């Protein structure tokens, strides 16, 4: 996360770290959506241009974390993966269209002060909140700048950007399964996700019921926090039919 | 599930985090 | 850079 701040304790209790077994290293962010299911970006698991194609046994998820590097004894919980599900129409070839994946845990994780699931948006909450100017929050342990790494979880609040502005900022083909967020060059404030934040959540707090909803997944950007560029996020609601299908048939 | 999105150390205790108001204020 | 995690999770 670029130009963010240290998270407060328990600020993002749905935050999940995707952790490589060997070598032991951070792979990505992710989010807890129930006691057995974790949501992330497809490119965290499958990205052929970078020779990335992880299997279940390659990975762990670490839940309830704050420190990036410490083993947080008595606080974090570490889970093995039973199964990975990637969206069947995930487009890793071109533009990361439908950049979404689910991971089912081998065993349910116990909730605590530091571990708690985020909500997924219904159609109405999505319609109400996914509007240009409305801010969401992005969290992760990724790089602090494009060209370094945080001691603890970072957080940054960023405004959703008008779709034409998103489109005009890039040569990449944007789709309805993405939205973009970030400040404009003139606005003064700045901030962005960066490498390592991939797969983490873009959340919004509904003013209707005071619950946190995951509207987006950290997906892609040209560099990090570049003027005139924006961060692109998987549109969780647009792909919720797939999410529900997977959970309903495999859990 | 039914309890999703309500943080034990914040919403469940009626405590606000330091920047959530920035979000609320943007929801015009 | 990372602190070692308990062996039980790598077994
Ligand atoms: N670039 C850091 C960054 C910045 C903002 C956000 Cl939201 C996420 C991220 C992290 N995501 C990533 O780094 C992902 C991983 C695969 C390629 N990728 C990119 O962002 C690539 N961006 S890119 O090369 O400028 C344009 C691009 C976008 C999609 C497919 C191919 C090329
Ligand atoms: C990625 O991994 C799976 C399983 O090991 C494999 O079948 C597939 O062909 C690989 N490449 C992809 C999905 O592009
Ligand atoms: Na364009
Ligand atoms: Na920017």
């Amino acid at each position: 996360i670029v130009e963010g701040s240290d998270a407060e304790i328990g600020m993002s209790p749905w935050q999940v770290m995707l952790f490589r077994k060997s070598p032991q290293e951070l792979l990505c962010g992710a989010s807890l959506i129930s006691d057995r299911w974790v949501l992330t970006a497809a490119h965290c698991l499958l990205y052929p241009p970078w020779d990335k194609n992880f299997t279940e046994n390659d990975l762990l998820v670490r839940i309830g974390k704050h420190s990036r590097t410490r083993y947080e004894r008595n606080i974090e919980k570490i889970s093995m993966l039973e199964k990975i599900y990637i969206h069947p129409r995930y487009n890793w070839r071109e533009n990361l269209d439908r950049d979404i994946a689910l991971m089912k845990l081998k065993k349910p994780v116990a909730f605590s002060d530091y571990i708690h699931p985020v909500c997924l948006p219904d159609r109405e909450t999505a319609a109400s909140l996914l509007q240009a100017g409305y801010k969401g929050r992005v969290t992760g342990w990724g790089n602090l700048k494009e060209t370094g790494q945080p001691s603890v979880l970072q957080v940054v609040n960023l405004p959703i950007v008008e779709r034409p502005v998103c489109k005009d900022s890039t040569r990449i083909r944007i789709t309805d399964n993405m939205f973009c967020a970030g400040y404009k060059p003139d606005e003064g404030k700045r901030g962005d996700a960066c490498e390592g934040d991939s797969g983490g959540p873009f959340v919004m707090k509904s003013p209707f019921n005071n619950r946190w909803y995951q509207m987006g997944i950290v997906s892609w950007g040209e560099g990090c926090d570049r003027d005139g560029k924006y961060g692109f996020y998987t549109h969780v609601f647009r792909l919720k039919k797939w999410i529900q299908k997977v959970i309903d048939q495999f859990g | 599930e039914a309890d999703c999105g309500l943080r034990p150390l914040f919403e469940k205790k009626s405590l606000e985090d330091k920047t959530e108001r920035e979000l609320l204020e943007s929801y015009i | 850079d990372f602190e070692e995690i308990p062996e039980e999770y790598l077994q």
Side-chain angles (χ1 to χ4, degrees), chain A residues 1-21 23-185 187-240 242-244 246-251, chain B residues 2-28, chain C residues 1-3 5-10:
Chain A
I1 301 289
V2 187
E3 295 287 316
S5 67
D6 292 351
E8 293 168 64
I9 300 304
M11 192 191 210
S12 191
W14 35 81
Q15 195 74 203
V16 173
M17 182 184 296
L18 236 199
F19 197 70
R20 190 176 195 169
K21 280 185 187 179
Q24 293 187 14
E25 69 185 5
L26 174 136
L27 289 176
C28 267
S31 63
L32 187 69
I33 61 175
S34 79
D35 66 2
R36 284 280 289 268
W37 289 96
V38 173
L39 182 63
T40 193
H43 81 261
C44 285
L45 304 167
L46 175 65
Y47 195 62
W50 292 356
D51 292 327
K52 176 181 289 162
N53 194 352
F54 290 112
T55 182
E56 290 74 8
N57 291 326
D58 292 333
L59 311 168
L60 294 173
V61 289
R62 300 175 66 171
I63 312 173
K65 290 189 67 48
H66 181 66
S67 175
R68 178 178 64 95
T69 61
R70 171 175 180 245
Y71 174 66
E72 292 176 290
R73 183 165 49 101
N74 290 188
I75 302 178
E76 76 171 278
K77 297 298 179 185
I78 305 182
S79 301
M80 299 179 302
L81 306 190
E82 179 179 330
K83 199 73 219 304
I84 288 157
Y85 308 87
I86 300 174
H87 197 288
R89 298 185 69 189
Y90 162 52
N91 188 341
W92 53 263
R93 298 188 148 267
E94 180 184 355
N95 58 0
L96 300 182
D97 198 14
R98 312 180 192 87
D99 189 10
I100 190 169
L102 286 162
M103 296 173 296
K104 191 190 182 194
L105 309 187
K106 288 195 177 181
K107 304 183 178 182
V109 67
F111 298 165
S112 68
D113 286 345
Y114 314 102
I115 298 179
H116 197 88
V118 71
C119 303
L120 301 186
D122 54 278
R123 181 175 309 271
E124 292 66 52
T125 298
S128 292
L129 296 183
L130 281 179
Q131 302 191 237
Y134 286 36
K135 291 175 179 175
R137 173 177 290 173
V138 183
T139 43
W141 294 276
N143 297 345
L144 297 170
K145 51 189 64 179
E146 185 180 328
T147 57
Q149 289 161 334
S151 167
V152 307
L153 186 66
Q154 296 296 290
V155 57
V156 67
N157 300 327
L158 300 167
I160 293 167
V161 171
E162 297 83 349
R163 190 163 294 271
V165 173
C166 299
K167 286 178 181 178
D168 285 347
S169 74
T170 186
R171 298 173 69 164
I172 302 292
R173 180 180 60 95
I174 305 311
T175 74
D176 284 355
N177 303 309
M178 313 168 184
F179 65 88
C180 91
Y183 292 101
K184 305 172 178 175
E187 288 179 296
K189 309 177 185 184
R190 60 196 309 116
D192 195 7
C194 204
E195 299 183 19
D197 293 318
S198 285
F202 178 107
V203 301
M204 303 181 82
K205 183 171 174 170
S206 168
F208 303 98
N209 65 2
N210 291 320
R211 291 180 189 250
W212 291 89
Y213 285 88
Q214 181 171 355
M215 312 309 303
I217 302 166
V218 176
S219 183
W220 65 270
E222 300 172 56
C224 314
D225 195 43
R226 294 189 191 170
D227 291 332
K229 300 298 183 182
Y230 300 91
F232 286 78
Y233 299 82
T234 308
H235 195 314
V236 169
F237 177 71
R238 251 209 144 234
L239 304 169
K240 196 181 178 183
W242 173 78
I243 294 176
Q244 202 63 223
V246 166
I247 295 176
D248 284 348
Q249 92 179 54
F250 295 116
Chain B
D3 205 35
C4 70
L6 299 170
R7 300 170 292 177
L9 297 178
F10 293 95
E11 288 74 23
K12 299 277 231 312
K13 298 170 63 164
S14 202
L15 292 179
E16 287 182 10
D17 75 50
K18 289 172 188 306
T19 68
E20 58 174 276
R21 181 161 282 123
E22 182 184 355
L23 305 189
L24 174 58
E25 291 168 355
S26 76
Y27 305 156
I28 61 175
Chain C
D1 193 356
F2 288 81
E3 176 170 10
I5 65 178
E7 300 174 345
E8 55 189 291
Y9 304 114
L10 300 164

